[PDB]
């Protein structure tokens, strides 16, 4: 059911997504170990992910959460990096994309910092890096992230290091 529509770099929607990518890069306490050493990206392509069934699955749940939280879905746009991006865009998020060992338990994790999601593109801790060069800081190989619409509803605030 999924089709991918390419956005033109001239499109305001390409530009605003690129700006969210670039402007939410930060330095990481691992010195680049997991995700690489970089202050910015070369954006190669931005595609809109269209799947009617997955979208309706999303909005159905969004309304349930809204009705449980004074008509407030508390919807954000957030980044997600995963070795499983291809399964996600075709079949949706499910238990197999959960971070079983994550600090807030076995759930699906998202980040405001694009660079935080970048640390997970080749696996937890960056895995062994890019499949071709085994480099977590590969400057050659193409990487993919998702920029996602996420319903948080009433969110449990965990103060954390």
């Amino acid at each position: 059911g999924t089709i991918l529509i390419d956005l033109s770099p001239d499109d305001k929607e390409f530009q605003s997504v690129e700006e969210e990518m670039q402007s939410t890069v930060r330095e990481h306490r691992d010195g680049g170990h997991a995700g690489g050493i970089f202050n910015r990206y070369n954006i190669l392509k931005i595609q809109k992910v269209c799947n009617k069934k997955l979208w309706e699955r999303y909005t159905h749940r969004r309304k349930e959460v809204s009705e449980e939280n004074h008509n407030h879905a508390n919807e954000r746009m957030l980044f997600h990096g995963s070795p499983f991006v291809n399964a996600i865009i075709h079949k949706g998020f499910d238990e197999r994309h959960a971070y079983i060992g994550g600090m807030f338990g076995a759930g699906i994790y998202f980040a405001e910092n694009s660079s935080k999601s970048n640390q997970y593109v080749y696996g937890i801790g960056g895995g062994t890096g890019c499949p071709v060069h085994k480099d977590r800081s590969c400057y050659i190989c193409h990487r993919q992230l998702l920029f996602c619409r996420v319903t948080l509803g009433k969110s449990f605030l965990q103060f954390s290091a």
């Binding site: 990206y41 070369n42 749940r61 957030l78 998020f93 807030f104 759930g107 998702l146 969110s155 103060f159």
Partner: protein, 47 residues
């Protein structure tokens, strides 16, 4: 997959040491996210 805390729909991880870190978030139902954009990129070697 775990469940949200009782009475909640997600968890927010608020940074409490690194002043520059933005928040991270966790949901416990796949239906609570839609993967809207696929971004293909390279990280760039600083000068």
């Amino acid at each position: 997959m775990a469940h949200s805390p009782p009475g909640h729909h997600s968890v927010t991880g608020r940074p409490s040491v690194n002043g520059l870190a933005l928040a991270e978030y966790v949901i416990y139902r796949g239906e609570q996210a839609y993967p809207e954009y696929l971004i293909t990129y390279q990280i760039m070697r600083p000068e």
